[PDB]
Amino acid sequence: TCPFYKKIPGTGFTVDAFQYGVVEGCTAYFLTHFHSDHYAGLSKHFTFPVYCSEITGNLLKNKLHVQEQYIHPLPLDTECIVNGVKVVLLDANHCPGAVMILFYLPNGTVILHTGDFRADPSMERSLLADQKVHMLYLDTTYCSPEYTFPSQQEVIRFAINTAFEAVTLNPHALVVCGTYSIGKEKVFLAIADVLGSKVGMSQEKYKTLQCLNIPEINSLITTDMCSSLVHLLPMMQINFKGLQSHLKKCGGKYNQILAFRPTGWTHSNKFTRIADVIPQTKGNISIYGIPYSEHSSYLEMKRFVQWLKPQKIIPTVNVGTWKSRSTMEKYFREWKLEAGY
């Protein structure tokens, strides 16, 4: 049954609640982004109204075959009326098409649902600046002070410099980047740009990237692997066995692989600077774990909430254990006492 933290009180609405069957009294299902834990349950047989971004609606139609008549895409940064209630979609700085949702309840309550997000000071100058928020439904993925990681820009600098060095030393090296969902496209696109290559991938992944409105995409990606020296593979295949196997397939065009696994946090983060990261190596194969996150660090999360000053916080992540829940509630109280709201 649908958990309370997926329901918007005072409305007919749910958020990211497609795996529960027909939810009683739900008149409109919102979807924040196209990640499987959130869309779980949608298919071509769904016949209720789904509200989402344009990019998310491209993916619903083309990848899951949801029929067009039930897809309701909304523009961002634009006041819209849905079943009698004003809503706004805001960029969540997550994966392509990911949104936060502002609901303006008929009784005067204002609710922000972050979906999945990476908080940024740029958010302090969106339509959030304009009014008070009573209830915050918060992506608390990394809600503990041990979770530190660098900016996306520092991580991409490291990856570009690493790839460019390796391939300039050895023009016969192949670069491989792991993927299992949309998101983190900057990693492989920035590497292919510095090398003057397109990124090669499977037809299924090419299809997915073509739904994303990325400018000049036809110039950057391809299904012709042989013409490319940056290849995308499933994240599961980014290991010595899986890579040795791929290298066989390229028919002696290449004699070395440099591979990237963009993880979020790993506890190498509590000890090592991005500058100091080193790969795991076996023979002519090296694998770098790089901490490219599309969720808030603890400090980014704290700064956002202390700026917003919500009356009540509802976590949407890490809610299954009492120890997690109690940890998170302690930090919420600290933040409120330090800031004074």
Kindly identify the residues of this chain, within the stretch 182-221, that bind Ni ion according to CB under 5 A.
Answer: none
* CB nearer Ni ion, residue 35 or residue 184: 35
Stretch that binds Ni ion, among 110-118, 150-158, 256-264, 309-317 (CB under 5 A): 110-118
Residue 101 corresponds to which tokens in the numbers above? 């949702």
* CB nearer Ni ion, residue 35 or residue 198: 35
Examine residue 116 and tell whether it contacts Ni ion (CB under 5 A). Answer: yes
Least distance (Å) from Ni ion to the CB of residue 92? Answer: 9
Stretch that binds Ni ion, among 27-35, 58-66, 85-93, 248-256 (CB under 5 A): 27-35
Least distance (Å) from Ni ion to the CB of residue 318? Answer: 14
Size of the site for Ni ion (CB under 5 A): 2
Stretch that binds Ni ion, among 109-117, 197-205, 255-263, 311-319 (CB under 5 A): 109-117
* CB nearer Ni ion, residue 143 or residue 175: 143
* CB nearer Ni ion, residue 177 or residue 294: 294
* Three-state secondary structure string covering the chain: CCCHHHEECCCCEEECCCCCCCCCCCCEEECCCCCHHHHCCCCCCCCCCEEEEHHHHHHHHHHCCCCHHHEEEECCCCCEEECCEEEEEEECCCCCCCEEEEEECCCCCEEEECCCCCCCHHHHHCCCCCCCCCEEEECCCCCCCCCCCCCHHHHHHHHHHHHHHHHHHCCCEEEEEEECCCCCHHHHHHHHHHHCCCEECCHHHHHHHHCCCCCCHHHCEECCHHHCCEEEEEHHHCCHHHHHHHHHHCCCCCCEEEEEEEECCCHHHHCCCHHHCCCEEECCEEEEEEECCCCCCHHHHHHHHHHHCCCEEEECCCCCCHHHHHHHHHHHHHHHHHHCC
Stretch that binds Ni ion, among 32-40, 126-134, 212-220, 243-251 (CB under 5 A): 32-40
Least distance (Å) from Ni ion to the CB of residue 33? Answer: 6
Examine residue 118 and tell whether it contacts Ni ion (CB under 5 A). Answer: no
Least distance (Å) from Ni ion to the CB of residue 35? Answer: 4
Least distance (Å) from Ni ion to the CB of residue 155? Answer: 18
* CB nearer Ni ion, residue 35 or residue 231: 35
Token match 């936060």: residue? Answer: 100
Examine residue 16 and tell whether it contacts Ni ion (CB under 5 A). Answer: no
Least distance (Å) from Ni ion to the CB of residue 197? Answer: 28
Least distance (Å) from Ni ion to the CB of residue 181? Answer: 8
11: number of Cβ within 10 Å? 20
Specify the amino acid at residue 120: D
Examine residue 35 and tell whether it contacts Ni ion (CB under 5 A). Answer: yes
Stretch that binds Ni ion, among 48-56, 111-119, 233-241, 323-331 (CB under 5 A): 111-119
Nearest residue to 106 via CA among 73, 129, 75, 84: 84
Least distance (Å) from Ni ion to the CB of residue 50? Answer: 17
* CB nearer Ni ion, residue 35 or residue 246: 35
| Cα separation, 44 vs 61, whole angstroms | 8
* CB nearer Ni ion, residue 277 or residue 319: 319
Binding site for Ni ion (CB under 5 A): 35, 116
